[PDB]
Every structure is written in structure tokens, then in C-alpha cells.
Amino acid sequence: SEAVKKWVNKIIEENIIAVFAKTECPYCIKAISILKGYNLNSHMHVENIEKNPDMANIQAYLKELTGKSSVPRIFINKDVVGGCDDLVKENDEGKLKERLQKLGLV
Ligand SMILES: [Cs+]
Ligand SMILES: [Cs+]
Ligand SMILES: [Cs+]
Ligand SMILES: [Pt+2]
């Protein structure tokens, strides 16, 4: 399905911070809260892919792009950050702030 891929691509390309998430997902909530703590709201988009008829196609494409089908799936300026554990590692080790600095976001 080209439509699904194009839809996912538009979300990633039109938002510097793009998070694919689902309902009642604690690690989604944690990752989003961490990102909002950098005052990134204006350049963030969160897409709930569970409330979507094509969830499985979206997840399969996210796995093709990132290696995992699970949510949260986090992209920053089209680069794959990964899941919430990946975000926590980057945040604790300073890489997240460097990412955001290079983008003029921090
Ligand atoms: Cs912060
Ligand atoms: Cs937003
Ligand atoms: Cs930090
Ligand atoms: Pt949005």
C-alpha cells in the first residue's frame, strides 16, 4: 500500500519531531512528556496509530524504517531515534540535547 507509506512519510517529513504512539501506552506517554519538557510542542506531532484502520500496515512500515514495529516510534528531523528507551539513553548521555541544538530547537 503506497497510500499508507505516503501518509507515514508526510507525518515524518512535515514535523521535525514525529512520534507514532497508541492508546494507554506508558512508554509513549513517558517519551512524549520528555520531549515536551524540551518545549518542543510547536514542532511535535503525535499520531495514535491504534485508532486507525491500517494499524498493521503502519506498524509494518515503521519496522521497515526503524527495525521495530512497536510504539512509541520516534523520528527527529527524519532521523530514527527509536523507542522510549532509545530516547532515554540519548537524553541521559546528552545526544538528545545535541540533536535539538543543531536544529535550533534548544
Ligand atoms: Cs529539558
Ligand atoms: Cs503539537
Ligand atoms: Cs538530560
Ligand atoms: Pt500535531
Side-chain angles (χ1 to χ4, degrees), residues 1 3-9 11-50 52-96 98-101 103-105:
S1 168
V4 170
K5 293 199 166 166
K6 287 159 176 179
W7 182 81
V8 169
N9 288 345
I11 286 165
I12 296 167
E13 294 163 335
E14 299 181 350
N15 306 279
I16 297 178
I17 314 283
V19 181
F20 297 86
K22 67 179 172 193
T23 316
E24 290 158 36
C25 162
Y27 286 104
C28 301
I29 292 158
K30 179 183 179 96
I32 289 162
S33 180
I34 291 181
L35 291 157
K36 285 192 180 162
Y38 282 91
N39 202 31
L40 299 180
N41 309 53
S42 46
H43 292 282
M44 279 186 81
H45 175 77
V46 176
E47 189 67 35
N48 177 346
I49 66 172
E50 175 168 34
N52 193 296
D54 301 316
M55 183 191 179
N57 310 109
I58 296 163
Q59 285 186 271
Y61 185 41
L62 292 174
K63 187 172 187 173
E64 292 178 3
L65 291 178
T66 74
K68 295 194 194 161
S69 60
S70 56
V71 293
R73 218 100 285 277
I74 306 165
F75 302 80
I76 295 191
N77 192 34
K78 292 168 280 184
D79 294 303
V80 180
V81 170
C84 182
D85 293 355
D86 297 304
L87 182 74
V88 163
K89 176 179 172 61
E90 287 198 13
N91 193 33
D92 286 8
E93 277 155 20
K95 194 182 172 33
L96 174 59
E98 192 204 270
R99 271 191 208 273
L100 304 175
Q101 261 155 18
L103 303 165
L105 297 171

